[PDB]
Design a protein around this ligand. Structure first.
Ligand SMILES: O=C(O)c1ccc(-c2nn(C(=O)c3c(Cl)cccc3C(F)(F)F)c3ccccc23)cc1
Ligand SMILES: CC(C)CCC[C@](C)(O)[C@H]1CC[C@H]2[C@@H]3CC=C4C[C@@H](O)CC[C@]4(C)[C@H]3CC[C@@]21C
Length: 240
């Protein structure tokens, strides 16, 4: 029963920190940016679009930081390992969470109140990277992740004892094994083990995420935003 409590605890932590409600996102799908509104975004300076997207991305990260802080055992890890896992994993989770806000039928994402395609972001001059991010969401879309599946999967994205730099590797392994059992137990209970063979290769998410964060650090270097840090040790690593 300790595992069934873990399943419930992870799904609750996700429910409290998912940022956008799935029902709102599904019902808002017919609300799509017009030709004119899309041109309004394309005409904004790179630096204004950077400011908008940087702040949306930091805020999304902060919801993932909160999600992690409510996973059982995460806070009992030493602070160095908290940073290690979140630095490597929190943006991976944001990229996974994107698929809920992404409509595969027209290849649009929910952005500032409406759905728009990737050409909304033309002014940023990162079409290849942004296209990669949209492609990743598109492939995740085919799984039709339930809310509980995405809760358990993104927990496992964070709690990964293979991250370089961990000090108490055994403690992370214990949490990881419990979450893996929780995930696999729940998939069996719901007759959804078929998604296992369809999850993305682990190297794919890490590769895409490194390219994403790389571009973000280049913008941040040219045009630094600042936010009130949720997790200052983690913040002061990437922004300072
Ligand atoms: O509130 C905080 O404590 C906090 C808030 C955000 C992060 C965090 N930002 N980030 C970025 O890539 C980022 C973003 Cl999203 C926007 C602008 C600039 C950046 C950059 F400078 F780091 F490149 C991350 C990547 C991976 C993991 C955690 C984070 C960390 C901590
Ligand atoms: C600086 C550039 C790399 C900007 C990247 C452009 C993207 C890929 O075009 C970004 C811009 C804003 C991002 C979104 C900001 C916030 C959210 C809410 C979160 O719950 C899911 C991800 C989601 C929906 C993000 C998905 C990726 C987006 C939609």
């Amino acid at each position: 029963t300790e595992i069934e409590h873990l399943v419930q605890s992870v799904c609750k932590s996700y429910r409290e920190t998912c940022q956008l409600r799935l029902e709102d996102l599904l019902r808002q799908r017919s609300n799509i940016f017009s030709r004119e509104e899309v041109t309004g975004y394309q005409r904004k300076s790179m630096w204004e679009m950077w400011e908008r997207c940087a702040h949306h991305l930091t805020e999304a990260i902060q919801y993932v930081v909160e999600f992690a802080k409510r996973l059982s055992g995460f806070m009992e890890l030493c602070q160095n390992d908290q940073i290690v896992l979140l630095k490597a994993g929190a943006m991976e989770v944001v990229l996974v969470r994107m698929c809920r806000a992404y409509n595969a039928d027209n290849r649009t994402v929910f952005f500032e109140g409406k759905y728009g395609g990737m050409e909304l972001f033309r002014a940023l001059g990162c079409s290849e990277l942004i296209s990669s991010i949209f492609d990743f969401s598109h492939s995740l879309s085919a799984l039709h992740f339930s809310e509980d599946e995405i809760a358990l999967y993104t927990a496992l994205v964070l709690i990964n004892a293979h991250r370089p730099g961990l000090q108490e590797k055994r403690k992370v392994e214990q949490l990881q094994y419990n979450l893996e059992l929780a995930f696999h137990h729940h998939l069996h209970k719901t007759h959804r083990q078929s998604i296992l063979a369809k999850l993305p290769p682990k190297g794919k998410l890490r590769s895409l995420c490194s390219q994403h964060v790389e571009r973000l650090q280049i913008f941040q270097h040219l045009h630094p935003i600042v936010v009130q840090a949720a997790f200052p040790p983690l913040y002061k690593e990437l922004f300072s």
